[PDB]
Structures are given as structure tokens and as C-alpha cells.
């Protein structure tokens, strides 16, 4: 795959191949995405969203077919329930605050108790060996923590790199680099695995000086491209989306 | 029919008997050799049950004939497993499949 | 759940705050551009980059206009920073104006003159929110009589040949509404029968009194300082390959709302004192009436010799005589 | 000093942005401003989520959380195509809805959670999926509306939300009413529904609407049904079973608690008789055998199978003698539901004068004291056992004559002695002696 | 010309439909990127209006007429043949233009693409002609990207014929991008299309490129050139042993390569030869090598079961001695003083051999070697060095 970088015709056959794939599966088709799990394995999939050297196009591809194959439907779904802000009332509910401590300080965004109904994750093992076909029902299963770890890292890499403006980013361009790896973080966060210090921390690695919890450039001013620019539109948009929500179950709670 | 040989060999005793689970690593591969299923990929073991029709019938007897910590390789003819219509997307129809099987524990 | 919908539009609703000057003063302040690195000409501000978004999002050609939620919001966040609203003194109500003047700058040096021009074209004659934040603003650019951006206006449709503009400016005449007596009898028997009325205002009853006013408060500001050569050109698009006369659609619209009044004056005949319901109707109606006068008037102001033959030879008559018996009779 | 808050760090960024660089991607000025415009405009949020906003009892959250994977799983399908599989997920998910209890409880979050409008706009994609060529999964349509209606009954403020859409539903009320067995799951039942025991909706309730219905059944006055006659049904110049739904949609929309809307009732009233065609060939006006001569060679058409029958799963049976009946029976009860009250008639209204007038001369009493003078068949013991039954879908009914008496009562008026009489030895006697002669235990 | 008519007498315009198809061409030509919003704005304008206007006219069925009666004759040289020359070589120009002509009638009109949803089944049907491939697969492109219900008019039939195409006509992206707009339109995704595009591409294995993980595996060799050559002194008959400390059968998802033996070099250079440098080869996956784990023997990148006493991967603590005789052609093997009775024979001599073991990570083997440097555990066969 790496030797593909100077057969243009076979790079782009196999980009179009990743993007019918993606197309193949595209909108919730659970039965489509275990079968394209025999094909397209975790391992692979892992191994092409670590590699630096991998080939801007094939690396897009398989963010895209990694996100369209398990994270997709729930992403999707959540996304559907994100407006409504259905809030049953127990004592932690009753226990919501509008401000944690005494003083007029607001809490970094998405940390605390959150009590409102929220869809129920569900996910099925992608074996081809058991006859039952409830499995094609759900998305295929994914190590979501391994993933997450992954993420981290390779964000905390990328905006080291990218800050010292080098002219061999990780797929080539700036665009390759970034756009691909912050959709996926925002997948990821859409879907709300990152809780507690992980959230503090790339909170911290998207603005150091707003987001300190009590030099290094953020991914705010670190002068991106327009496509960068619009996925950090759509992180910041979810983080006032989550404070609406806190406000939301605080003025429930005085209710 | 279901044809076993031998990779490594195992306990030698102890057989897989019916109102049991059978937690097993295995790796399928088409007879041309191209993989199609793994779970030491997906880093999990596989559990199932003996006799409860929930796994494909050639994969079932070959483990059945299989000892605790016996690595062997199991055969199966399209007719014991797939038989015609074949899996949709995974496995072409009328085709042979090599599995290779780890008894890893009875429970 | 009671006192969430309760609290809403009792407290959260009611809330106000002003923030429009200072958005439209930040927006329009240049943010050290030249100290930027820029290798060329002068880069457009924010609020000059808003407006080309919202007029190339207009020009693009729909079978219909759609509404867009930032629309109906940043073009009543402009008006609101256009207008800013015991004699005060004459030196007090210059700096006023020279203020306003000022802010109309703001606006109408980035392109919003062509804009709410070219959203109304686009609106292919279609009564909607839309039209009616683009009518406000045109408002809020033209309050005082600007001839600055009376001259941009007139210059862009002069040199875009924009038919649809009188076209969709006919067609929204067509669609404004009246006084309907059948709905006001509806709305008198659900109230006698007790039922509440989901409508506080009974505005099934001249469903739109805002847009009327509006649009021609938008004609007239349009022909304001009897400006000849816009006054001309409403009545005869001499360039345009169709020309549509708004000066005979005025007064089309003016002979329906005094037909609509005799009518609600011929109901409230027979009854001994008229209630408060009536009361803002009448209210309502007689301000709409007031401003399609005002349109008309100043048409024909400067002696626009057009104009007075065209409105001498149209039905204006038959609605002054319908006038006049309803004024006979109401005193 | 830090902005130390997310909003105000917004505030700095997005104008740094744009007044840094001229942006070039229309989608990339869209989410700047849209997102400046939130971050200087908090109470919008605060106002777009409260009505929104909703609080559940823990004890039946469990529930809830079923309903909004119910109602997610909707959703996806909504995005999703429309096929054989969609329409079972689609037909299984609306069965589900209406087994959750919570469902009947809380209407409020029902209506905040817009399922109404999901369901109305899965109706849409599939009637406008083949609408020449006949409505495709009548099936999960007749799900769909049967959601819509219990909707309507489960609380009136669900009307007044179903109430705005009733101009599409009476564009498409056209699409399964000729069908037997669909009769309460159409758009058309939708829309009665709707307005159906909602005094405050019928007066709001709009007069293009009621001409819209006039003219649907102007032209099944015309023109005949198609596909019965593809069936093979013997050919007749008018659609009863098509002229009856919108019948009965007016009579919904003019009768409301007893009382008769006048304002509906003058204008439903005014378009039927500018519209002579909707009335059928009995009342033509010209060369019509009337009323009783119709329903008479109707009963004629139930007894000749050929008449009555296609004669070229029961429920395909359409007999064409008792559709005719029930469509005269309904036209009656429609205009005696606009006939006007006493009250007003003491009062002496002009309008309500002449409307009484108007229907007089429309029907003339001797039809109706002929039909109540027509009696029907009596069930009989066989001498095996069995006590043989005509059938109650063919043939004469009761509720035929109940509505003739509905409009003798409110339109004609009862008032005169020897009349008073005279209707009794004609057509009520026999009818009494009838019932006298049933009340043995096999024939009760 | 069809009616057998002489030639002479038929009148064909040649050169005045290749210059008006050239222009028509010109005259639906899209709008250039570079021009401003409000010029972009205009051209559209006028394009959409020219489509509607040949539409509602009907000018595509002429064109689809003119398509037909030229796609009557079979090839350059048959119409040459059957008219005249010159028409034989303009012929697959006039009908490339006019394929492209109908697709520029057709892009960004849903109504023209709407109404060409009842001739979508005729077009499919000339697909797999030369002439026309890709012509017919751009207008395919453009009708199922515009027009849902020519999405909705694809059958199982004529979804397995692109499929048929990519194959025989060899990978092509077009026919992906094609695939692609089938699976989704406008957001919609059908999912009968999405099923059979799997079903029927997906499990062969055999078009699109297959990828997979594979563990780097690297060969040791010692500083030994053993060969043998007419009339030189080399000893024909050698002999070493191999001693594993320690392995590992799994420190990845994939098994651990584990292979012992001789290869053989390319004539007389100390350079391996007929196989690669780096990557997951080892020794018997070429002619050159010859391999042994245990329970296969490998040469030529083929596997053969060999027998065994007690049968065994190769595991922690086994001794695999490796015997190599030139004379007659022979590798054999004996495992822990078992003899195997698998055995090389046969083979080229014309190089030079030496020992060698192929691996992959999680391995702890020894060479023993004999003499100083080891010893060997079993005795070695009588006359070998």
C-alpha cells in the first residue's frame, strides 16, 4: 500500500474501491457492513489509521470507511436525539446545578452529571461462523477504547507536527492530515465515549489558555485550512450544544 | 464429511461433551487461501454450545473430535457448511472451507 | 411541565437585550488587515463578506425562495443597528441624523442596497418572513429619504433590466390581505360561545397589518424628496422589455381596503356600540389606509405629471367617494 | 487576559477568521455566522429548547426509552428508501407506538417529539411514489392514517396540530376509498379526524375545502368508477361508494355536538345546490324517477345478482344496490344536518328561512314518507333449525330510514295532526309489528 | 443505405453533422470555473433553458435515432464497407459526439433525466460494445446521478451487467463511480441496490484489489558457498542442525513464520536468487529456496503435508537436522533423530547453496553448525560433511 504512492492509477482505483465500500454500507446497512467486516478487517483498519506514511487519498478512505462501517448509525442516531432534551426527574437530577461551586465559574464543557435520555449503544460481534442472523442486526462491533487512546495520541501528535509547519505532513497535505482525523474525533465525541480527563485533555489540546483547569499554540490559531476550519466549526458547535443542555437540566432541576 | 489433522497436539483426554461451551480461536480462509473470518483479529474468543444448531455443521463436529489445547485444522466440504446459496457478500456459493481451530478451554 | 412552557414565554421570552450596534461595529471594524500580510488589495470585512453570501444565496436560481434561519436573523440584527430606535433641540435632531446617516453607510456601502433588491426579486412575489425581514431592512436603509442609496437602487435595476423585481412587487400587492367579515363573525361566535381563541389578536382578520405597512412604507420611502427619475421609472419601466405599473397596483389595493372598510362599517350598522374587537380592527385598517394614502401622495408629489394622469384616468375616484361616505357616516 | 469563557472565545475567532482571510467556501461563512449569531444570542437557545423540553416519571422512563427507539428507528427509515421490508419495519414500529402506554399518556411529548409530522411525511413519500399508477403498500398507508386518527382521539390539542395539514389530505383524499375493508384508514378519515367533534376546528375550518370535497363529488356524480368496471362491475353513470366517504366527511364537518354549525352548514348547502350533480340521478331534476323510485329499483338491483354483483376477501363484494342506498342515506342526513334549528327558525332569520325553503324544494315529503312506507325482509326459521339471515351489507337497512327521519324531523316538520298519523299507519306500524314479531330468543 | 441502395445516389452529410455536432457541443457547453457567481448564474440560465427547450422539442430521440441506425453496423471497416470510406473514418467520431452530445443534453436537468428513465433499458444494452462504453457509462453516470427514478427503474439484470463490464473490460473507475451513485441519490440509499452490489461484486474476490496484513519475515544465512561443478574438489554431501530456545505461535494476529533449509543463488553470485528483498517471503516460497516447518515442505510457494513421528508445528526445544546431498539431487530432514520421508529431489545445481532459516518476530534459534563455532546433537549420516 505504501509502494502504491507511484501507481496513480492503482491508488485512485483503490480510492474509488474505499469509497463504494463506504457507499455500499452507507445509512445504517448493518448486513452490508458485517459482510464488508470479512473484507476490510479491524487490524488493517487500526494499522491504516496509525501509519504515517500512508497516501493522503487511501487514508481519508479508510477514516471514512471505519467511521461508515461502525460509527455511523449510533453517530447518526444520537445526532437525531441531540435536539429533543426528554429529562426524567430522580436526585441526580434534583442534585443538577447551574454552577458547581460557589462562585459564577463555568465547568468545562460536557464534564458533570448529565440525567437526560440518551439512545442505548448497541453493537454485535462480526462472526461468520455462528448461523443466528439476529447479528445482522446493530453495527459491528469496534475497540472503542483502544480507539479512543489511539485518537489521543494521534491528535496530540499531529497538532505537535503541524505547529512547526514542516513541509512532510502525514498524507501529504495539511488538508490530509487534519481533516480525516478531526472528523473521526468528532464522531467519537457526537457520540459521547470520551468522558472525565480524555475530554479535559483534548479540550486542553483544542485551546490551551480558555480550557485550563484549576507557547504551545491551539488548534484555534494554528492557521488552518478552510476544510480544518468548518470540522472545528462543527466541534465547537456540539460544545455550546452540550452547555444548552446542561442549562437545560439545571433549570428542570429548580422546576 | 469433516476431515481433522493435527497442528499441535493437545491434552489428549478430555473431549468437548454435549451441554458444554467451547471456547475456541479460530481463523477461516477460503481453499484458495484468502482469509475470511478471524477472531484473533477481533482479539475475543468464540463461545457456543454443543449440539444447539448455532454454528455451521462441519465447524461443529470437527470440534467436537478436537482435545482441550489441541490446535487443528478442520476441513469442510460446501455441503456440511453453506451448501449452495452460500453467504451473501462473504462466501462464494459451493466452496470448501479451512478453519484452524484452538481448543483454548472447556466451560 | 406547565410552569417550563409558562416560564418560557413568560420570563425567557420577554428578556431583551441590545447587542445589534455593537455586533454591526465589530463586524464592520477592519481587523489590522495592512498590518496582516495581504500581497494584494485590501481584503473585504466580515460584514461586506455576510452580505455577498446573502445576495449570491439570492441569486441563485429556485423554483421557489427558501427561508433561511440566518437570513431572518442577521438582516433584523442590520435593521436594528440601522435604526437604533421634551422637543429636542435643532442642533440635537442634526447630530440624530447625521448619525443615522452614518449607520446607513454602515449597511449600504457593503452592498446591502442590491441585496434587498435582489432577495425580493427572488422572492418571485411570495408573502413570507423572508420578504418581510428583507422589506424591514430596505426600511431600515431608506428611513430619512437616502438618495445615495435610492441612486445604488435605482442603478442596479437600471443596468440588471430586473423584470422580476415589479413583477414579485405586483405580486406581493396582489397577496396582501383585507378586512374579512366572515372570519370576524367566526371569531365573535367561538368568543360567545366561550370556547378560547387560539389567536390573542384575531388575526385571521387582516391576516398581515406588519407587511402591509412595511411594503408600502418601502414605496414610499422609495419616492421620497420627490425623487422624479425613481417616481417615472415605478410607472414606466422604459428600459425593462415589460414594464408593470405598481402606481395602478396601489391603487387597485386601495379601492379592496375601502371596499373591506365600507363593508365592516355596513356590519357595524345596525349595532348600537362597537366593541373593542371591532375597535382594532377599525384601528388596523385606518393605519393601513393612512399608509397606502401616504404611497400614493407621494407618487404624485413634484408635480409628476405621469403619475397624476395615470391615477386621474385609474379607479382612484370610486375609492375617495367610498371614503367619503364612510367618513360622513363614522362622524 | 484569557476570554474565559467558550462563548466570548468564539466571539474572537470567528471574526479573527473572517477579517484574516476572505473565505471562499459558502458552507464555511454559513456555520462562522451561524455560530457567532448563537454565541451573541443565548436566549435563542433557551427559547428554541424549552418547548422542546420535557420531564418523564422514573417509573416510566423504561417505557419512554422503548418509544424513542421506536421512534428512531422510524426516523432512519424515513432516510432510508422505500421498500417490501421498510413497509413491515414501518407497519411492526407504528404496531409498537401505539402498545407503549406512554404513548397515551403523555400526548404533549408526542407532539414535542414531531411524530405526527414524521408520519405524515412517510405518507407523502409513498403517495407521491406512484400516483398515477395507483397508491404502492396500501398497507402500511392504511397504518399510517389509522396512527394519525387515534392521534386526533388521543387529546384535542393533537387536532388542532393535525388540523394544518388538512389541505393536503383533502389533495389526496382520492386514494383508497373505493376499496372495501380501507374504510377508516384514508386520508380522507384523516381529515375527519381532524375536525371531527372540534367545534372551535369547524369554524376555523376554511370554505375552499368544502368546495374542494364538492367538486370530488361532483365528479363521482359524473363520472363512474374505473376500477370496478376493471373488475367488472356493470357499468352505471355515478360512484356511490366513492360519494359517500366525502358525504360523510361534510356531515363530520357541518354537524358538531348535536348542534348544527350554520356557517358551514349555509356554505356546504350554497355549493351543493350550485353543484345540482352531486345530488345522483334520482335527484337530477330533470328526468329523475326520484328518491323512492330509486331506492325501489335498488332493491330490485339487490335481489338480481347480476345487478347487484360484479358477476364478471369477501370484502371485494361490493354490493352496488346497498352502495347506492347508503350514498341516498347520507346525502339525506348531510342536508339534514345543515337544516337550521328551531330557535332560529322562531326567531324568523331570513337566511335560515330560505335554506329550509331551499331544502323542501330539493326533497319533496312524499319520498320520504314512500321510503319509511318500503319495509324490509324478516329473517325466518328453515325447517331444519336454522333461522336463514340476508345479508346485512345488501339489501335494506335501518339506519337508510333513520336518516330519513332525521331529515323529516329537522327540515319538514312534524307539527300537523292527521300527518302525524298518516306517517304512523304508513310506515311505522309495520316496522313496530316487525320488531314485535322478532322478539322470540332465536330471532332476538 | 440500410435498403441496399447504391452509394452514390444516397446522400450523407458527413462533414456538415461533424461540425454541427461540434458545435452543438460548444453551445451546451458547461460554464468555466473562473468566471464570477454572477456569470456562472447567467450561463446556467441559458444552458437550463436551451435543455428544456430541446426536450420539449424532442431532440433527444433524434439523437437516440441517430445512435441506433449507426450502431446498426458493427465496426469502422463495416461501415466503411457499406458506405463510403470517408463515413468509415468518421463513424466512431460521429458516434463518440453524439454519446457526448446527449450527455451534455442531459446533465443538471432532473425533468431530462427523468424522461429518459423509460430508454435507460436500451442504453444498458449496448454497454458492452467498444465503440461505446465509455460514452454510454458517462450518460449512465449522469441519469442516475440527477434522476432518482431512473434509480428506482435499474433491475437485478442490468445492475449485474456493469458488474459484467468492469470485468471483462478490466478495472475502470467510472464503472465504480457508477456503482456509487446507485447505492445513494440525493441522500436516499436503496437498499436492494446496495444488496445486490454486494452480493454479486464483493464475494468473488477477484475484481477489485484485496488487501491484508502480513508479518515481515527475514532469512539468516552463514558465511558458507557450497556448490558443485564438474571436475572441482567440493564435497558432494553437507550437513547441519538447527536448535530452537524459544518460540512463540502467536505475537500477532497472524501465525509466526518459522521455516528452515538451503537456497540456492542466481549462477555463480553470492546474491539470493528468484526471490524479494523485503517483505513475507521466506525460504521455499520460491524455486530457489528449499523450506521445511515441520509439517510442510515448501518450495515454489507451495505446501506439501510430510508425515511425522508425533506430527507437531515447530515448537520450543526441538532440533531440526537438515542433510543436503549433490551427487543425486536430494534434500532431506530428520526432526529430533525422527526421519521425515519427504525429501527434494531433482533439482538445479547450477548455483550455489547454503543454509538458511526464515522468521518472523518471537523466535530464539541457534545454528548448530559443527566444529567450533557448535556440535551437533545426533550423530550425522555416515559420509556427510
Same mark, same amino acid.
Given at each position: ?255 | ?107 | ?132 425581514? $428583507? ?35 405586483? *405580486? ?21 360561545? *366561550? ?40 410607472? $414606466?419601466? $422604459?428600459?425593462?422589455? $415589460? ?89 | ?444 | ?385
Amino acid at each position: 500500500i505504501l509502494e502504491l504512492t507511484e501507481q496513480e492509477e492503482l491508488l485512485k482505483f483503490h480510492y474509488h474501491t474505499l469509497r463504494l465500500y463506504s457507499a455500499v454500507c452507507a445509512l445504517g446497512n448493518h448486513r452490508v457492513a458485517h459482510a464488508l467486516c470479512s473484507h476490510v478487517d479491524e487490524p488493517q483498519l487500526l494499522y491504516a489509521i496509525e501509519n504515517k506514511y500512508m497516501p493522503g487519498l487511501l487514508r481519508a478512505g479508510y477514516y471514512d470507511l471505519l467511521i461508515d462501517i461502525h460509527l455511523s448509525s449510533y453517530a447518526t442516531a444520537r445526532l437525531m436525539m441531540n435536539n429533543e432534551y426528554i429529562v426524567p426527574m430522580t436526585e441526580e437530577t434534583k442534585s443538577i446545578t447551574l454552577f458547581p461551586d460557589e462562585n459564577k465559574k463555568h465547568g468545562l464543557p460536557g464534564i458533570g452529571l448529565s440525567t437526560s435520555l440518551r439512545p442505548r449503544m448497541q453493537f454485535s460481534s462480526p462472526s461468520f461462523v455462528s448461523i443466528s442472523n439476529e447479528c445482522y442486526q446493530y453495527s459491528p462491533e469496534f475497540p472503542l477504547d483502544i480507539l479512543k487512546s489511539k485518537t489521543i495520541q494521534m491528535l496530540t501528535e499531529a497538532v505537535k507536527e503541524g505547529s512547526l509547519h514542516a513541509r512532510d505532513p502525514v498524507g501529504g497535505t495539511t488538508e490530509f492530515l487534519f481533516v480525516p482525523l478531526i472528523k473521526l474525533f468528532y464522531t467519537l465525541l457526537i457520540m459521547g465515549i470520551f468522558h472525565n480527563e480524555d475530554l479535559k485533555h483534548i479540550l486542553q489540546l483544542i485551546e490551551p489558555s480558555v480550557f485550563k483547569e484549576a507557547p504551545k499554540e491551539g488548534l484555534l490559531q494554528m492557521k488552518l485550512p478552510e476544510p480544518v476550519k468548518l470540522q472545528m466549526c462543527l466541534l465547537l458547535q456540539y460544545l455550546c450544544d452540550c452547555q444548552v443542555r446542561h442549562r437545560i437540566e439545571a433549570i428542570v432541576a429548580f422546576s | 464429511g469433516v476431515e481433522i489433522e493435527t497442528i499441535s497436539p493437545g491434552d489428549g483426554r478430555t473431549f468437548p461433551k454435549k451441554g458444554q461451551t467451547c471456547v475456541v480461536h479460530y481463523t477461516g480462509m477460503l481453499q484458495n487461501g484468502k482469509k475470511f473470518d478471524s477472531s484473533r483479529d477481533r482479539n475475543k474468543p468464540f463461545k457456543f454450545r454443543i449440539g444447539k444448531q448455532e454454528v455451521i455443521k462441519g465447524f461443529e463436529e470437527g470440534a467436537a473430535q478436537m482435545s482441550l489445547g489441541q490446535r487443528a485444522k478442520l476441513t469442510c466440504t460446501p455441503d456440511v457448511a453453506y451448501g449452495a446459496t452460500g453467504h451473501p457478500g462473504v462466501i462464494p456459493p459451493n466452496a470448501t472451507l479451512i478453519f484452524d481451530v484452538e481448543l483454548l478451554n472447556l466451560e | 411541565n406547565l410552569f417550563l412552557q409558562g416560564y418560557e414565554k413568560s420570563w425567557i421570552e420577554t428578556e431583551e437585550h441590545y447587542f445589534e450596534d455593537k455586533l454591526i461595529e465589530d463586524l464592520a471594524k477592519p481587523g489590522a488587515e495592512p498590518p496582516e500580510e495581504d500581497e494584494g488589495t485590501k481584503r473585504v470585512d466580515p460584514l461586506h463578506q455576510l452580505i455577498l453570501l446573502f445576495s449570491r444565496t439570492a441569486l441563485t436560481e429556485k423554483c421557489k425562495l427558501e427561508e433561511d434561519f440566518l437570513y431572518m436573523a442577521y438582516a433584523d440584527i442590520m435593521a436594528k443597528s440601522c435604526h437604533d430606535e421634551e422637543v429636542k433641540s435643532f442642533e440635537e435632531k442634526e447630530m440624530e441624523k447625521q448619525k443615522l446617516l452614518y449607520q446607513q453607510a454602515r449597511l449600504h456601502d457593503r452592498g446591502a442596497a442590491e441585496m434587498v433588491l435582489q432577495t425580493i426579486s427572488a422572492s418571485k412575489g411570495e408573502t413570507g418572513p423572508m420578504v418581510a425581514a $428583507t422589506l424591514k431592512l430596505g426600511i431600515a436603509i431608506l428611513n430619512g429619504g437616502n438618495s445615495t442609496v435610492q441612486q445604488k437602487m435605482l442603478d442596479y435595476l437600471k443596468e440588471k433590466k430586473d423584470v422580476g423585481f415589479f413583477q414579485s412587487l405586483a *405580486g406581493l400587492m396582489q397577496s396582501c390581505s383585507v378586512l374579512d367579515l366572515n372570519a370576524f363573525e367566526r371569531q365573535n361566535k367561538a368568543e360567545g360561545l *366561550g370556547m378560547v381563541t387560539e389567536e390573542g389578536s384575531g388575526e385571521k382578520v387582516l391576516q398581515d397589518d406588519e407587511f402591509t405597512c412595511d411594503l408600502f412604507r418601502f414605496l414610499q420611502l422609495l419616492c421620497e424628496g420627490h425623487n422624479s427619475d425613481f417616481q417615472n421609472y415605478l410607472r $414606466t419601466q $422604459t428600459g425593462n422589455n $415589460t414594464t408593470v405599473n405598481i402606481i395602478i397596483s396601489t391603487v387597485d389595493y386601495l379601492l379592496r381596503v375601502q371596499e373591506s372598510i365600507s363593508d365592516f362599517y355596513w356590519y357595524y350598522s345596525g349595532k348600537d356600540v362597537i366593541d373593542e374587537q371591532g375597535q382594532r380592527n377599525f384601528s388596523k385598517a385606518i393605519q393601513v389606509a393612512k399608509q397606502v394614502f401616504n404611497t400614493l401622495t407621494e407618487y404624485i408629489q413634484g408635480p409628476c405629471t405621469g403619475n397624476q394622469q395615470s391615477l386621474a384616468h385609474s379607479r382612484l375616484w370610486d375609492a375617495v367617494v367610498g371614503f367619503l361616505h364612510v367618513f360622513a357616516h363614522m362622524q | 487576559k484569557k476570554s474565559s469563557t467558550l462563548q466570548q472565545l468564539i466571539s474572537e475567532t470567528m471574526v479573527r477568521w473572517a477579517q484574516e482571510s476572505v473565505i471562499e467556501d459558502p458552507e464555511l461563512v454559513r456555520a462562522m455566522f451561524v455560530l457567532l449569531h448563537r454565541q451573541y444570542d443565548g436566549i435563542g437557545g433557551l427559547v428554541r429548547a424549552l418547548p422542546k423540553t420535557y420531564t418523564i416519571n422514573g417509573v416510566s422512563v423504561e417505557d419512554t426509552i422503548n418509544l424513542l427507539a421506536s421512534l428512531g428507528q422510524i426516523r432512519s427509515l424515513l432516510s432510508v428508501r422505500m421498500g417490501k421490508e421498510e413497509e413491515k419495519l414501518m407497519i411492526r414500529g407504528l404496531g409498537d407506538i401505539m402498545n407503549n402506554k406512554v404513548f397515551y399518556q403523555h400526548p404533549n411529548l408526542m407532539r414535542a417529539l414531531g411524530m405526527h409530522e414524521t408520519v405524515m411525511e412517510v405518507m407523502v413519500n409513498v403517495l407521491g411514489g406512484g400516483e398515477s399508477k395507483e397508491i404502492t403498500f396500501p398497507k402500511m398507508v392504511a397504518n399510517c392514517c389509522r396512527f394519525l386518527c387515534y392521534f386526533c382521539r388521543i387529546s384535542r390539542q393533537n387536532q388542532k396540530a393535525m388540523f394544518d395539514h388538512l389541505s393536503y389530505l383533502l389533495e389526496n383524499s382520492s386514494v383508497g376509498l373505493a376499496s372495501p375493508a380501507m374504510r377508516g384508514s384514508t386520508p380522507l378519515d384523516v381529515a375527519a379526524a381532524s375536525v371531527m367533534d372540534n367545534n372551535e376546528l369547524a369554524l376555523a375550518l376554511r370554505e375552499p375545502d368544502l368546495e374542494k370535497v364538492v367538486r370530488y363529488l361532483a365528479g363521482c356524480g359524473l363520472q363512474s368508477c374505473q376500477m370496478l368496471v376493471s373488475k367488472g362491475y356493470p357499468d352505471i353513470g355515478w360512484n356511490p361508494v366513492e360519494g359517500e366517504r366525502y358525504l360523510d366527511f361534510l356531515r363530520f364537518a357541518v354537524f358538531c355536538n348535536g348542534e348544527s354549525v350554520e356557517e358551514n352548514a349555509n356554505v356546504v348547502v350554497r355549493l351543493l345546490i350550485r353543484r345540482p350533480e352531486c345530488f345522483g340521478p334520482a335527484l337530477r331534476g330533470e328526468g329523475g324517477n326520484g328518491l323512492l323510485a330509486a331506492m325501489e329499483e335498488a332493491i330490485k338491483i339487490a335481489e338480481d345478482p347480476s345487478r347487484d354483483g360484479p358477476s364478471p376477501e369477501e370484502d371485494d363484494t361490493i354490493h352496488m344496490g346497498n352502495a347506492i342506498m347508503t350514498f341516498y342515506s347520507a346525502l339525506i342526513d348531510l342536508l339534514g344536518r345543515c337544516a337550521p334549528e328551531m330557535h332560529l327558525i322562531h326567531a324568523g332569520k331570513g337566511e335560515a328561512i330560505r335554506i329550509r325553503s331551499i331544502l323542501r324544494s330539493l326533497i319533496p315529503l312524499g319520498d320520504l314518507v314512500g321510503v319509511i312506507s318500503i319495509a324490509f325482509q324478516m329473517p325466518t326459521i328453515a325447517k331444519d333449525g336454522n333461522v336463514v339471515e340476508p345479508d346485512m351489507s345488501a339489501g335494506f337497512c335501518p339506519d337508510h330510514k333513520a336518516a330519513m327521519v332525521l331529515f323529516l324531523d329537522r327540515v319538514y316538520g312534524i307539527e300537523v295532526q292527521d300527518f302525524l298519523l298518516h306517517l304512523l299507519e304508513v310506515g311505522f306500524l309495520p316496522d313496530l309489528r316487525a320488531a314485535a314479531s322478532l322478539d322470540t330468543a332465536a330471532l332476538s | 443505405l440500410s435498403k441496399k441502395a447504391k452509394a452514390s445516389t444516397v446522400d450523407l452529410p458527413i462533414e456538415s453533422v461533424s461540425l454541427s455536432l461540434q458545435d452543438l457541443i460548444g453551445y451546451f457547453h458547461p460554464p468555466d470555473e473562473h468566471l464570477e457567481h454572477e456569470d456562472k448564474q447567467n450561463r446556467l440560465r441559458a444552458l437550463k433553458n436551451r435543455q428544456n427547450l430541446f426536450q420539449e422539442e424532442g431532440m433527444i430521440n433524434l439523437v437516440l435515432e441517430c445512435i441506433d441506425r449507426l450502431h446498426v453496423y458493427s465496426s469502422a471497416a463495416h461501415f466503411a464497407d457499406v458506405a463510403g470510406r470517408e463515413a468509415g473514418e468518421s463513424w466512431k467520431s460521429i458516434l463518440n459526439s453524439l454519446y457526448e452530445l446527449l450527455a451534455a443534453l442531459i446533465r443538471g436537468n432532473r425533468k431530462n433525466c427523468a424522461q429518459f428513465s423509460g430508454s435507460l433499458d436500451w442504453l444498458i444494452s449496448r454497454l458492452e460494445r467498444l465503440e461505446a462504453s465509455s460514452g454510454i457509462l458517462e450518460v449512465l453516470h449522469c441519469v442516475l446521478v440527477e434522476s432518482p427514478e431512473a434509480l428506482n427503474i435499474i433491475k437485478e439484470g442490468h445492475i449485474k451487467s456493469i458488474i459484467s463490464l468492469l470485468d471483462k473490460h478490466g478495472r475502470n473507475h467510472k464503472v465504480l463511480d457508477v456503482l456509487c451513485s446507485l447505492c445513494v441519490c440525493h441522500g436516499v440509499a436503496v437498499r436492494s441496490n446496495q444488496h445486490l452490489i454486494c452480493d454479486n461484486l464483493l464475494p468473488g474476490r477477484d475484481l477489485l484489489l484485496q488487501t491484508r496484513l502480513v508479518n515481515h519475515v527475514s532469512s539468516m544465512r552463514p558465511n558458507i558457498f557450497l556448490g558443485v561443478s564438474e571436475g572441482s574438489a567440493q564435497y558432494k554431501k553437507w550437513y547441519y542442525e538447527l536448535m530452537v530456545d524459544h518460540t512463540e505461535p502467536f505475537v500477532t494476529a497472524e501465525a509466526t513464520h518459522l521455516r528452515v533449509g538451503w537456497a540456492s543463488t542466481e549462477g555463480y553470485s553470492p546474491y539470493p536468487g528468484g526471490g524479494e528483498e523485503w517483505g513475507g517471503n521466506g525460504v521455499g516460497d520460491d524455486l530457489f529456496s528449499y523450506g521445511f516447518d515441520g509439517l510442510h515442505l515448501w518450495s515454489g510457494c507451495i505446501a506439501r503435508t510430510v508425515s511425522s513421528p508425533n506430527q507437531h508445528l515447530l515448537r520450543t526445544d526441538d532440533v531440526i537436522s537438515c542433510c543436503l546431498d549433490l551427487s543425486a539431487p536430494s534434500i532431506s530432514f530428520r526432526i529430533n533423530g525422527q526421519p521425515v520421508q519427504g525429501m527434494f529431489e531433482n533439482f538445479n545445481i547450477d548455483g550455489l547453496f547454503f543454509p538458511v532459516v526464515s522468521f518472523s518476530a518471537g523466535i530464539k534459534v541457534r545454528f548448530l553448525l559443527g566444529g567450533r563455532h557448535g556440535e551437533f546433537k545426533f550423530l550425522p549420516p555416515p559420509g556427510y560433511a
